Design a protein that fits this description.
Elements: H1 23-34, H2 44-51, E1 55-61, H3 70-86, E2 92-98, H4 106-121, E3 144-145, E4 148-155, E5 171-177, H5 189-202, H6 225-228
Parallel strand pairs: 1-2
Antiparallel strand pairs: 2-5, 3-4, 4-5
Bound molecules: protoporphyrin IX containing FE and a molecule of 2 linked components (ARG-PGL).
The site of a molecule of 2 linked components (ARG-PGL) has 10 residues, from strand 4.
PDB class: biosynthetic protein
Keywords: hydroxylase, biosynthetic protein
Assembly: monomeric
């Protein structure tokens, strides 16, 4: 009944022509990308999380929205949130949305991303957190679910220049609770070092530099919604235009 998988469990998601039958290969492509030796994947935190067994997985099968869709993903997210606090601080949930769509454009995958986040909100059993503004135009808005804010971003095969966000053939959602950044806040010595190290990785991996909405690298960032769906170029969305 649970669609929350550790690495060793992903193979039980599905086999052959059945729901999630495409998930084990998507899992393998993802791990190949994040564990690659040369050039290394730019986010060493993601690589370390994979190497240490701290990445969990789920999926959405768009052919079966009533049974393998947002209602099931809300259950998986609640289970993951418990895991994220019981285990180590730097855990990530990676959610593959498939089957893969040949030739999809990036704008289409971003639309599907925001639609899925909206559908998930309908299955939340907890009120919105009192410490996070509910207005998506507020500089400090963040997406919330099950009582706390998350960082959540979209990966897609349609990222051609921002190769770091091409994690395989499927739209992929990367969820983290905010304890993952504890100790690397933007004003901290370790936080500035973290951004330096990742951005140097991007300069050895991607065809385009760090996106401006990630900030200059010496402070924390507002309007985090724009980071969820980075464009493949240097365009900058209007701050009050979050699609939620
Ligand atoms: C499978 C897991 C992960 C993946 C796929 C991933 C992916 C990425 C990517 C693609 C970027 C480049 C910026 C962007 O596209 O948004 C990035 C930056 C970053 N990530 Fe990771 N990440 C993962 C896990 C983590 C974790 C667990 C942490 C916790 C410390 C973390 C902290 C950071 C930081 C600090 C940056 C730099 C932001 C900046 O330069 O402004 N990541 N990550
Ligand atoms: N993929 C990606 N950009 N991962 C890093 C997200 C960092 C988030 N925005 C965060 O809250 N960082 C702490 P801050 O103090 O604002 O830099």
């Amino acid at each position: 009944e649970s669609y929350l998988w550790r690495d060793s469990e992903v193979s039980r998601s599905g086999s052959g022509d059945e729901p999630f039958g495409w998930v084990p290969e998507a899992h393998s492509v993802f791990t190949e990308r994040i564990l690659a030796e040369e050039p290394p994947y730019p986010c060493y935190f993601g690589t370390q999380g994979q190497q240490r067994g701290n990445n969990s997985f789920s999926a959405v099968d768009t052919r079966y929205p009533d049974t393998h869709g947002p209602a099931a993903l809300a259950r998986s997210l609640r289970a993951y949130r418990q895991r994220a606090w019981q285990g180590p601080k730097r855990q990530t949930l990676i959610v593959f949305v498939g089957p893969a769509v040949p030739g999809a454009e990036l704008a289409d995958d971003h639309r599907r991303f925001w639609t899925l986040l909206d559908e998930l909100r309908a299955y939340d059993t907890e009120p919105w957190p009192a410490d996070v503004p509910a207005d998506p135009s507020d500089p400090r808005w963040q997406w919330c679910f099950d009582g706390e804010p998350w960082f959540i971003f979209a990966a897609s095969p349609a990222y051609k220049d921002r190769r770091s966000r091409d994690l395989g053939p499927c739209l992929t959602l990367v969820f983290q609770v905010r304890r993952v950044f504890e100790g690397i806040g933007g004003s901290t010595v370790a936080g500035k070092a973290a951004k330096r190290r990742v951005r140097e990785g991007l300069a050895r991996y991607d065809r385009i530099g760090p996106h401006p909405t990630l900030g200059d690298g010496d402070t924390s960032t507002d309007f985090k919604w724009r980071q969820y769906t980075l464009p493949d170029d240097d365009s900058v969305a209007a701050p009050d235009a979050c699609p939620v």
